[PDB]
Amino acid sequence: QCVNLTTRTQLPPAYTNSSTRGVYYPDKVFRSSVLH
Amino acid sequence: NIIRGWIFGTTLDSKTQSLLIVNNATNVVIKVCEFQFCNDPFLGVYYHK
Amino acid sequence: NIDGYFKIYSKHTPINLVRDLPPGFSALEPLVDLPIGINITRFQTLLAL
Amino acid sequence: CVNFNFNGLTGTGVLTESNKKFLPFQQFGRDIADTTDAVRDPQTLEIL
Amino acid sequence: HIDAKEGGNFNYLYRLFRKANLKPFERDISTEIYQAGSKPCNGQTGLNC
Numbered sequence: 001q002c003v004n005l006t007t008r009t010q011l012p013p014a015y016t017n018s019s020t021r022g023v024y025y026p027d028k029v030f031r032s033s034v035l036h
Numbered sequence: 037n038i039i040r041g042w043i044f045g046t047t048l049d050s051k052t053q054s055l056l057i058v059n060n061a062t063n064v065v066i067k068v069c070e071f072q073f074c075n076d077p078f079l080g081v082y083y084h085k
Numbered sequence: 086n087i088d089g090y091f092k093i094y095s096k097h098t099p100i101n102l103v104r105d106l107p108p109g110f111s112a113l114e115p116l117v118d119l120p121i122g123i124n125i126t127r128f129q130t131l132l133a134l
Numbered sequence: 135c136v137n138f139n140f141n142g143l144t145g146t147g148v149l150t151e152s153n154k155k156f157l158p159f160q161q162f163g164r165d166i167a168d169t170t171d172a173v174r175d176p177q178t179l180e181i182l
Numbered sequence: 183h184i185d186a187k188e189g190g191n192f193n194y195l196y197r198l199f200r201k202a203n204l205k206p207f208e209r210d211i212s213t214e215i216y217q218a219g220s221k222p223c224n225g226q227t228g229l230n231c
């Protein structure tokens with residue numbers, strides 16, 4: 001019921017950098033006004 | 037709004053369980069079933085006036 | 086995906102650029118911790134076409 | 135200067151009406167040293 | 183008193199052959215054939231399958 005699609009491009013992917021993106025919370029602990 | 041969600045798994049066949057996320061419009065659906073995915077999966081309708 | 090739980094953290098910010106992943110600091114907040122308990126090795130994106 | 139036990143969090147001190155503001159889910163606050171310095175009453179939602 | 187029958191209670195399966203130990207709180211219902219030797223399995227219970 002699903003189709004097959006092939007690309008028509010002729011180049012690999014590019015590359016960027018994550019400057020300071022991607023910081024999450026490593027634990028569920030509530031911390032306030034601290035440096036961990 | 038072309039990005040709808042992701043697929044997560046190992047073999048992406050019926051012989052292994054997988055995870056699926058589809059935000060469609062109202063509500064998001066997250067299922068862990070045994071999906072037999074297509075080689076090129078995408079969501080269905082866009083609109084019809 | 087650690088110890089059976091699938092954890093998602095997200096953020097949503099308004100920008101207006103063309104072809105740039107904008108620099109700056111980003112802190113993502115927890116969305117969900119789902120107890121799905123599956124070995125996960127590969128993934129793929131769902132497009133609405 | 136009583137012994138207290140609010141949500142399984144025990145202690146011993148003087149309870150007093152507080153002016154601190156908690157997030158809607160927060161149940162207790164912490165000092166610079168890891169000591170509970172404010173707790174939310176789960177029956178009146180009051181922070182003290 | 184509830185899980186034993188006079189003829190036998192042959193529900194309650196269990197796994198015996200896995201290529202690696204499970205991780206904490208991980209579930210597995212893979213029901214594939216597990217080659218035990220080095221010959222291919224071809225999905226058929228045989229010598230080392």
Ligand SMILES: *[C@@H]1O[C@H](CO)[C@@H](O[C@@H]2O[C@H](CO)[C@@H](O)[C@H](O)[C@H]2NC(C)=O)[C@H](O)[C@H]1NC(C)=O
Nearest residue numbers: 058059060061062063064065066067079080081
């Ligand atoms: C889009 O997501 C919505 C979220 O509500 C889903 O709508 C459900 O459609 C199913 C049939 O496929 C119904 O049985 C449910 O009653 C609907 N949801 C509710 C209100 O509980 C659905 O998963 C997606 N697609 C559709 C059909 O809207």
Ligand SMILES: *[C@@H]1O[C@H](CO)[C@@H](O[C@@H]2O[C@H](CO)[C@@H](O)[C@H](O)[C@H]2NC(C)=O)[C@H](O)[C@H]1NC(C)=O
Nearest residue numbers: 046047123124125126201202203204205206208
């Ligand atoms: C999680 O699944 C991965 C991939 O299926 C497993 O890693 C594979 O292990 C098999 C058998 O030991 C090897 O033949 C493959 O070369 C491995 N693949 C990779 C990508 O390393 C892994 O063992 C599984 N982990 C657990 C604990 O279930």
Ligand SMILES: *[C@@H]1O[C@H](CO)[C@@H](O)[C@H](O)[C@H]1NC(C)=O
Nearest residue numbers: 001002003004005074075076
């Ligand atoms: C292309 O897609 C069809 C169905 O969408 C599938 O039957 C076929 O095996 C696919 N071919 C390849 C090479 O992936």
Ligand SMILES: *[C@@H]1O[C@H](CO)[C@@H](O)[C@H](O)[C@H]1NC(C)=O
Nearest residue numbers: 016017018019105106107108
């Ligand atoms: C990171 O990317 C930005 C914009 O893409 C660029 O200005 C900067 O020079 C890059 N820095 C490094 C170390 O790649």
Ligand SMILES: *[C@@H]1O[C@H](CO)[C@@H](O)[C@H](O)[C@H]1NC(C)=O
Nearest residue numbers: 174175176177178179180181
């Ligand atoms: C809990 O019970 C107390 C007295 O039994 C009542 O005053 C209060 O409204 C109830 N609900 C909440 C959310 O505290």
